Amino acid sequence: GSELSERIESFVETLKRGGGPRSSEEMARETLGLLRQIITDHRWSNAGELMELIRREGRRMTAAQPSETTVGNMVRRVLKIIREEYGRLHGHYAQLQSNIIEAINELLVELEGTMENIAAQALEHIHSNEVIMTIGFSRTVEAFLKEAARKRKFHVIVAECAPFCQGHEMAVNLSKAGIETTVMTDAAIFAVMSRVNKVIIGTKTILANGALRAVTGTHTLALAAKHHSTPLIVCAPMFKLSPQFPNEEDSFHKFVAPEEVLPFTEGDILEKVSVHCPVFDYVPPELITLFISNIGGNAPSYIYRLMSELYHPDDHVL
Amino acid sequence: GSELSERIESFVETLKRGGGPRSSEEMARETLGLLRQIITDHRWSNAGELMELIRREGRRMTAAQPSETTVGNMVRRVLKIIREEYGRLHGHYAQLQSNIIEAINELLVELEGTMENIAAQALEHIHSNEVIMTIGFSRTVEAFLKEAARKRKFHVIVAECAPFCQGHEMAVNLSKAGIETTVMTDAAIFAVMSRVNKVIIGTKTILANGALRAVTGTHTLALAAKHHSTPLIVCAPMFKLSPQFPNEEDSFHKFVAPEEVLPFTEGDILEKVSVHCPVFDYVPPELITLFISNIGGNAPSYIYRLMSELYHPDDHVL
Numbered sequence: 055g056s057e058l059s060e061r062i063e064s065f066v067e068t069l070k071r072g073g074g075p076r077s078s079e080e081m082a083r084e085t086l087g088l089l090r091q092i093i094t095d096h097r098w099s100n101a102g103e104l105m106e107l108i109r110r111e112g113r114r115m116t117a118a119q120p121s122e123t124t125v126g127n128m129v130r131r132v133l134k135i136i137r138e139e140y141g142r143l144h145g146h147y148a149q150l151q152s153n154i155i156e157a158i159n160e161l162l163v164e165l166e167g168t169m170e171n172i173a174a175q176a177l178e179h180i181h182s183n184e185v186i187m188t189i190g191f192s193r194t195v196e197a198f199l200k201e202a203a204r205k206r207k208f209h210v211i212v213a214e215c216a217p218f219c220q221g222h223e224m225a226v227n228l229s230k231a232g233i234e235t236t237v238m239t240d241a242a243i244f245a246v247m248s249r250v251n252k253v254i255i256g257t258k259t260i261l262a263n264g265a266l267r268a269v270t271g272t273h274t275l276a277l278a279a280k281h282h283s284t285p286l287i288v289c290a291p292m293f294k295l296s297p298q299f300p301n302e303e304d305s306f307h308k309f310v311a312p313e314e315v316l317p318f319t320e321g322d323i324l325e326k327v328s329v330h331c332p333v334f335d336y337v338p339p340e341l342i343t344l345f346i347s348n349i350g351g352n353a354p355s356y357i358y359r360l361m362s363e364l365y366h367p368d369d370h371v372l
Numbered sequence: 373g374s375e376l377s378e379r380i381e382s383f384v385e386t387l388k389r390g391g392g393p394r395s396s397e398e399m400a401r402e403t404l405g406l407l408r409q410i411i412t413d414h415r416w417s418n419a420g421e422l423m424e425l426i427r428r429e430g431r432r433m434t435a436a437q438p439s440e441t442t443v444g445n446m447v448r449r450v451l452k453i454i455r456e457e458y459g460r461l462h463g464h465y466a467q468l469q470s471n472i473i474e475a476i477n478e479l480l481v482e483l484e485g486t487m488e489n490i491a492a493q494a495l496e497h498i499h500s501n502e503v504i505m506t507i508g509f510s511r512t513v514e515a516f517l518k519e520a521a522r523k524r525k526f527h528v529i530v531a532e533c534a535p536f537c538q539g540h541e542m543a544v545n546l547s548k549a550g551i552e553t554t555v556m557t558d559a560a561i562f563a564v565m566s567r568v569n570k571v572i573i574g575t576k577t578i579l580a581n582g583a584l585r586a587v588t589g590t591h592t593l594a595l596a597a598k599h600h601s602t603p604l605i606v607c608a609p610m611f612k613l614s615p616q617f618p619n620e621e622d623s624f625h626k627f628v629a630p631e632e633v634l635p636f637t638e639g640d641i642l643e644k645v646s647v648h649c650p651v652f653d654y655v656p657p658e659l660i661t662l663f664i665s666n667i668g669g670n671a672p673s674y675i676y677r678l679m680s681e682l683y684h685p686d687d688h689v690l
């Protein structure tokens with residue numbers, strides 16, 4: 055009853071104010087648990103009313119934070135699960151609900167295996183004495199690299215992300231496992247690119263065009279890789295896949311307080327200058343060489359088929 | 373008298389039949405000595421008659437072997453020296469001859485210094501733990517690399533030249549000095565190019581367009597370097613500079629017996645198949661990053677000015 059309502063609220067405000075939970079895998083787990091509790095703790099008999107209330111609460115979620123697309127695309131995954139179950143039972147009400155629940159359960163148990171799947175897949179993409187470059191921080195990519203390091207020796211060049219220098223803690227984490235790690239400013243990306251073999255980077259969201267929304271500055275790294283023709287690898291699980299297209303959407307970049315870019319102590323100039331701090335940026339699919347997912351490697355030119363396999367095309371608007 | 377005639381002949385037939393001397397630096401030395409002996413052992417009073425007989429014998433030389441452009445372009449150098457001396461003394465007959473002789477002497481003493489000059493210049497182009505790739509055999513390039521190796525550690529990938537696998541002896545010579553050397557077939561150029569930092573190659577002739585005539589297969593290596601945007605360096609002394617342009621000329625490629633490509637023992641198919649063995653090939657200037665010479669480094673877009681500095685424009689046809 056009101057527990058469900060206040061938990062939905064709590065989650066909405068946690069998504070709105072700050073980043074909670076930090077890992078987007080934990081965010082997917084939390085939103086899936088909440089969707090399960092909603093579909094269990096409501097008086098819905100027909101699948102249509104359930105889908106409608108799910109779409110409404112998902113609209114509220116998406117309005118809470120548009121840049122966090124995992125919640126929305128997993129809501130769409132739940133909607134596709136409901137559609138599949140209704141087609142199975144109609145192409146049956148209690149069995150409907152329990153079958154939806156076991157579908158969500160299998161989705162959740164395969165959710166925690168994507169990390170291990172990518173880690174296992176990592177070995178056949180790294181050779182000895184290779185030079186990797188990565189930008190920012192990504193749990194999936196550091197797991198990739200520290201799993202490849204157990205049987206291979208290679209160098210990782212971590213380009214810090216300004217202003218949020220998450221790349222520093224990533225470099226430290228990689229050095230923990232003895233992965234020879236060079237830390238540099240993002241300004242030195244093109245200067246060092248000539249000596250890099252591969253580029254491995256995570257992402258926040260993959261669009262239907264194949265493009266991906268990743269931390270700012272990664273588009274420049276992709277342009278450098280394309281200039282030097284080095285393969286650019288994206289190790290992104292299959293819950294960051296978003297059916298929306300690049301310019302049919304709104305609110306792509308996430309702008310945070312310019313205090314991160316230019317501090318308050320600069321004084322009077324802060325009334326004359328316009329400071330901008332875009333967290334995310336757009337990378338076209340032409341600059342991506344290969345996508346690594348929990349199922350296996352795939353070219354950017356197959357992400358649309360993955361969409362068709364994951365999301366109903368009438369649910370791309372929620 | 374007849375000594376000069378028979379020596380000129382001997383040289384013509386040596387150039388016509390085979391490669392003598394082997395090193396084109398020694399070829400430049402020999403042709404300069406012969407030009408000196410001609411200008412000394414003829415009864416010429418006016419500079420015009422001397423220039424005319426020089427042009428005639430140079431035409432005979434060029435007809436002996438068109439692919440060997442060092443002889444012709446150094447004949448043009450001697451003609452430019454004669455023009456400069458005549459302009460100095462006219463803008464004076466015995467002094468004319470002795471001044472031409474001392475000009476040839478300074479040209480010759482600076483001729484043997486180009487090797488050492490490039491070797492000295494080599495250090496500021498190689499950094500530690502760098503991956504060089506080269507194709508075929510080139511005395512200048514191996515001197516470059518073994519001089520850089522005295523103070524730096526780096527890897528050299530030598531692509532053998534089919535059919536004349538001169539790259540094997542180059543790899544052996546480089547390994548003599550402890551330069552970690554990988555030997556491969558030319559077929560693996562693009563496969564390995566992704567892990568190469570620089571490409572350093574010699575040449576047989578540099579054209580006025582900036583393009584260069586080098587051993588077959590080097591155009592593919594240059595295309596691979598351009599694809600991967602790796603800098604391509606050409607360590608060529610300033611006596612391989614030819615004022616002729618790419619397609620205003622004749623007889624660019626040198627075709628040798630196809631026995632080198634397909635052996636006689638193949639039998640009847642040798643009457644039905646057409647075999648071709650081009651020794652040289654054309655590399656456009658767009659694929660060269662930097663030229664290294666005895667004077668210093670220069671972009672391909674300055675070779676025309678070097679021409680203006682070396683050859684009179686009315687002597688480009690001999």
Ligand SMILES: O=C(COc1ccc(Cl)cc1)N[C@H]1CC[C@H](NC(=O)COc2ccc(Cl)cc2)CC1
Pocket residue numbers: 183184185209211236246249501502503527529554564567568
């Ligand atoms: O030591 C490093 C560290 O590299 C960087 C560290 C930091 C920065 Cl800022 C940039 C680069 N990288 C190695 C990577 C292998 C390479 N080459 C070799 O070991 C040999 O390479 C070959 C050998 C044979 C073939 Cl067929 C191809 C390449 C030496 C340098």
